[PDB]
Enzyme design. Structure first.
Site, PDB file in Angstrom:
ATOM      1  N   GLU A 108     -14.495  -2.925 -12.891  1.00  0.00           N
ATOM      2  CA  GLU A 108     -14.686  -3.568 -11.596  1.00  0.00           C
ATOM      3  C   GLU A 108     -15.585  -4.789 -11.759  1.00  0.00           C
ATOM      4  O   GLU A 108     -16.357  -4.872 -12.715  1.00  0.00           O
ATOM      5  CB  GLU A 108     -15.304  -2.579 -10.605  1.00  0.00           C
ATOM      6  CG  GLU A 108     -15.576  -3.150  -9.223  1.00  0.00           C
ATOM      7  CD  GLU A 108     -14.313  -3.534  -8.480  1.00  0.00           C
ATOM      8  OE1 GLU A 108     -13.490  -4.289  -9.040  1.00  0.00           O
ATOM      9  OE2 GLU A 108     -14.140  -3.074  -7.331  1.00  0.00           O
ATOM     10  N   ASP A 109     -15.484  -5.738 -10.833  1.00  0.00           N
ATOM     11  CA  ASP A 109     -16.302  -6.947 -10.904  1.00  0.00           C
ATOM     12  C   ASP A 109     -17.702  -6.725 -10.329  1.00  0.00           C
ATOM     13  O   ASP A 109     -18.696  -7.057 -10.971  1.00  0.00           O
ATOM     14  CB  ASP A 109     -15.609  -8.137 -10.221  1.00  0.00           C
ATOM     15  CG  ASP A 109     -15.135  -7.822  -8.813  1.00  0.00           C
ATOM     16  OD1 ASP A 109     -15.516  -6.763  -8.270  1.00  0.00           O
ATOM     17  OD2 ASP A 109     -14.384  -8.644  -8.245  1.00  0.00           O
ATOM     18  N   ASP A 112     -21.186  -3.182  -4.364  1.00  0.00           N
ATOM     19  CA  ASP A 112     -22.177  -3.478  -3.335  1.00  0.00           C
ATOM     20  C   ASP A 112     -22.697  -2.192  -2.703  1.00  0.00           C
ATOM     21  O   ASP A 112     -23.838  -1.798  -2.941  1.00  0.00           O
ATOM     22  CB  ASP A 112     -21.589  -4.401  -2.265  1.00  0.00           C
ATOM     23  CG  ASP A 112     -22.654  -5.007  -1.370  1.00  0.00           C
ATOM     24  OD1 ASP A 112     -23.711  -4.371  -1.179  1.00  0.00           O
ATOM     25  OD2 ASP A 112     -22.436  -6.126  -0.857  1.00  0.00           O
ATOM     26  N   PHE A 161     -25.085 -12.241  -1.246  1.00  0.00           N
ATOM     27  CA  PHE A 161     -23.656 -12.427  -1.458  1.00  0.00           C
ATOM     28  C   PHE A 161     -23.437 -13.564  -2.447  1.00  0.00           C
ATOM     29  O   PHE A 161     -23.704 -14.725  -2.141  1.00  0.00           O
ATOM     30  CB  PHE A 161     -22.941 -12.729  -0.143  1.00  0.00           C
ATOM     31  CG  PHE A 161     -21.443 -12.663  -0.243  1.00  0.00           C
ATOM     32  CD1 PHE A 161     -20.706 -13.785  -0.584  1.00  0.00           C
ATOM     33  CD2 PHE A 161     -20.772 -11.475  -0.002  1.00  0.00           C
ATOM     34  CE1 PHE A 161     -19.329 -13.724  -0.677  1.00  0.00           C
ATOM     35  CE2 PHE A 161     -19.393 -11.409  -0.094  1.00  0.00           C
ATOM     36  CZ  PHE A 161     -18.672 -12.534  -0.433  1.00  0.00           C
ATOM     37  N   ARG A 174     -13.233 -20.389  -7.103  1.00  0.00           N
ATOM     38  CA  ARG A 174     -12.489 -19.844  -8.234  1.00  0.00           C
ATOM     39  C   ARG A 174     -12.800 -20.648  -9.491  1.00  0.00           C
ATOM     40  O   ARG A 174     -12.853 -20.106 -10.595  1.00  0.00           O
ATOM     41  CB  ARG A 174     -10.986 -19.880  -7.956  1.00  0.00           C
ATOM     42  CG  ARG A 174     -10.606 -19.461  -6.546  1.00  0.00           C
ATOM     43  CD  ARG A 174      -9.727 -18.223  -6.538  1.00  0.00           C
ATOM     44  NE  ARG A 174     -10.462 -17.023  -6.920  1.00  0.00           N
ATOM     45  CZ  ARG A 174      -9.986 -15.787  -6.808  1.00  0.00           C
ATOM     46  NH1 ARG A 174      -8.769 -15.578  -6.325  1.00  0.00           N
ATOM     47  NH2 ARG A 174     -10.732 -14.756  -7.178  1.00  0.00           N
TER      48      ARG A 174
HETATM   49  N1  LIG Z   1     -21.377 -10.625  -3.230  1.00  0.00           N
HETATM   50  C1  LIG Z   1     -20.633  -9.417  -3.102  1.00  0.00           C
HETATM   51  O1  LIG Z   1     -21.228  -8.297  -2.964  1.00  0.00           O
HETATM   52  C2  LIG Z   1     -19.097  -9.479  -3.134  1.00  0.00           C
HETATM   53  N2  LIG Z   1     -18.492 -10.646  -3.367  1.00  0.00           N
HETATM   54  C3  LIG Z   1     -17.152 -10.739  -3.406  1.00  0.00           C
HETATM   55  F1  LIG Z   1     -16.590 -11.897  -3.639  1.00  0.00           F
HETATM   56  C4  LIG Z   1     -16.388  -9.587  -3.198  1.00  0.00           C
HETATM   57  N3  LIG Z   1     -16.995  -8.421  -2.963  1.00  0.00           N
HETATM   58  C5  LIG Z   1     -16.236  -7.241  -2.750  1.00  0.00           C
HETATM   59  O2  LIG Z   1     -16.753  -6.417  -1.735  1.00  0.00           O
HETATM   60  C6  LIG Z   1     -16.228  -5.133  -2.008  1.00  0.00           C
HETATM   61  C7  LIG Z   1     -17.132  -4.110  -1.570  1.00  0.00           C
HETATM   62  O3  LIG Z   1     -17.608  -3.248  -2.532  1.00  0.00           O
HETATM   63  P1  LIG Z   1     -18.426  -2.004  -2.067  1.00  0.00           P
HETATM   64  O4  LIG Z   1     -17.452  -0.900  -1.562  1.00  0.00           O
HETATM   65  O5  LIG Z   1     -19.321  -2.430  -0.931  1.00  0.00           O
HETATM   66  O6  LIG Z   1     -19.250  -1.490  -3.189  1.00  0.00           O
HETATM   67  C8  LIG Z   1     -16.083  -5.053  -3.479  1.00  0.00           C
HETATM   68  O7  LIG Z   1     -14.815  -4.639  -3.789  1.00  0.00           O
HETATM   69  C9  LIG Z   1     -16.308  -6.382  -3.967  1.00  0.00           C
HETATM   70  O8  LIG Z   1     -15.332  -6.735  -4.856  1.00  0.00           O
HETATM   71  C10 LIG Z   1     -18.335  -8.333  -2.926  1.00  0.00           C
HETATM   72  O9  LIG Z   1     -18.948  -7.087  -2.678  1.00  0.00           O
END
Ligand SMILES: NC(=O)c1nc(F)cn([C@@H]2O[C@H](COP(=O)(O)O)[C@@H](O)[C@H]2O)c1=O
Length: 192
Positions: A108-109, A112, A161, A174
């Protein structure tokens, strides 16, 4: 073990210290993790993984809008395997918006709150794989978290964020290789 910890103060070098595209000059307020820094950390993450799992693995790459992280990580894993035996490796995917009797590795990336991954673990446990470990480049320190902790963590960061590297914001950032904090100008600008 807890990953590279970035403290609440003072995290993230100023924008002027690293190459940032001119059109994102105002949409970011601070850089947390430069691209090459993510690279070097991910490399060691490939080793940590390989020594935690010595039996043909299944790279289950969580798939949303990005690909960068699991692309880099798997590249380094492929670099390690490039010395030893003819080691096989299946990479699978799971889209969010087979593995039974297999050594699985969820990639996973960022985590949160954790729910996303927690729910993902439940669904996978149902198929009864031999073992399942999770790797996450980023794990955010936040009271909104449910307590779940990955087996492998790249960095731990403040409750902000961020965008860049592999993270976007409505299909934006991107081409931003740095994990940075999006500013209020950017949120309003790139609002859906
Ligand atoms: N800055 C962030 O926490 C964030 N940034 C993104 F671009 C996308 N996300 C997405 O939010 C989703 C929420 O994750 P979570 O269920 O809160 O642990 C994640 O799948 C994550 O990929 C972020 O949480």
């Amino acid at each position: 073990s807890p990953g590279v910890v970035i403290s609440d103060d003072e995290p993230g070098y100023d924008l002027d210290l690293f190459c940032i595209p001119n059109h994102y000059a105002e949409d970011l307020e601070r850089v947390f993790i430069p691209h090459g820094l993510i690279m070097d950390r991910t490399e060691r993450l490939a080793r940590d993984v390989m020594k935690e799992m010595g039996h043909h693995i299944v790279a289950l790459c969580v798939l949303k809008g990005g690909y960068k992280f699991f692309a880099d990580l798997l590249d380094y894993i492929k670099a390690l395997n490039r010395n030893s035996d003819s080691i096989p490796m299946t990479v699978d995917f799971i889209r969010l918006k087979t593995l039974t009797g297999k050594n699985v590795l969820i990639v996973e990336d960022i985590i949160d709150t954790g729910k996303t991954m927690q729910t993902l673990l439940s669904l996978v446990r149902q198929y009864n794989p031999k073992m399942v470990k999770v790797a996450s480049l980023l794990v955010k320190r936040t009271p909104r978290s449910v307590g779940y902790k990955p087996d492998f963590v790249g960095f731990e960061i403040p409750d902000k964020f961020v965008v860049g590297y592999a993270l976007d914001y409505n299909e934006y950032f991107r081409d931003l290789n740095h994990v940075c904090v999006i500013s209020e100008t950017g949120k309003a600008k790139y609002k859906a």
